[PDB]
Amino acid sequence: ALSLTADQMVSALLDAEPPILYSEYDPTRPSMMGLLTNLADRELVHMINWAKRVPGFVDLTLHDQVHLLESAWLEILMIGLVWRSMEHPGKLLFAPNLLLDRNQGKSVMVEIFDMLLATSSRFRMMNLQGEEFVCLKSIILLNSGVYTFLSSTLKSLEEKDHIHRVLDKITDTLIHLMAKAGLTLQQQHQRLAQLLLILSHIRHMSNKGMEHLYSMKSKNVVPSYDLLLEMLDAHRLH
């Protein structure tokens, strides 16, 4: 678990990658938020499966797993989107059959389209690599909720220590990747820093986004603890 080598970490993360889903609409017919919501809902099921395959995540309590996903899920959809969109300047590839520019975001939203587009830009600028992307996405999963375990039972302390050890392992892994690519030591820590500072912006976008979903006043429109629990709380019967 914490015994994995760097290439073992990378391979594990790459293997765990969720699928790219399609928007569900009649391509033979002439709804924006509805399309985006349906897509996100289906992605979330796959995100749970992905999380359970991030090395060290299942070692956590069921409760702490839920807490981490409750905190990170929109950031994770967003970094997924920004990655998919990297090779489509000016557009967001929500799905292979749903490629939108900023003008199409005006039907509701263009404020958060603009933020997403700029992140995609920034990724393009840095020439972000696939192996770097999956590290970052796992870092979001582990880090986003780790400061909000309002708890300090012995168990909670052990949980927080474990999470920071897994995070250290991914740091080592990112550095390894950049060493593997020929970067100098200075280039390595500079790029590590550049990559991690983008995570703050992704946090920001998730907050502006959560702000919309909460403004809708829809009873299901933000995944409840209980929904996330139902989805993570698997049996071993299959």
Add this chain to the structure above:
Amino acid sequence: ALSLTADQMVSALLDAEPPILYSEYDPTRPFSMMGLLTNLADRELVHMINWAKRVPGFVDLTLHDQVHLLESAWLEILMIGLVWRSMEHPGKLLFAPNLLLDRNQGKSVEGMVEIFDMLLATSSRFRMMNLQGEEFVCLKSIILLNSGVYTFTLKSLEEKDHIHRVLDKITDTLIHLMAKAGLTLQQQHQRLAQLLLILSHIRHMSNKGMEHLYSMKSKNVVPSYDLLLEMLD
């Protein structure tokens, strides 16, 4: 500014540090929490502008871009300051030397104890990491340069490039500090990452806080571009 050594960067940042202000209230009268905190934050902001102008590379930017960066960062910068001076007061927030509050005192306005709890947890994280003063001023400068840089023409391309060069320099500086402290190369990279990942939480806290002040519907409870412009210009 891009020609500073790591030690010169650290000296510059340490010298740039704003003063610790006091809360303004009559200490002889019986103990408005929001009013006290707002008055304190208002006065800190003026000193923040002076500090920002002293961060190496900041005044090299256009005045427009200076304003944009402060507009994005100002609440994060107040928050990291608070968390830092609270570090050695477990369970409390040292808003000012004469205003040390625990979470119970945060319950006076609705929606405030949640923000208190987050601030306290960050302070705890700082305590656990044994955060050093030199690291703190690096981090605060990083917030200033980074928070607005993804939400901005050839001039703008040049501005963004400059900002990222200054950020790289502060990264170099943090690593140099950890080197001086004798950490291994592995430990250096791990601690760099741990420090930077806390900045995501501080952003989160700023967003929750901005949400409070916007909810107040007070005419100028969020500092305007033009007020920031006036103080910077």
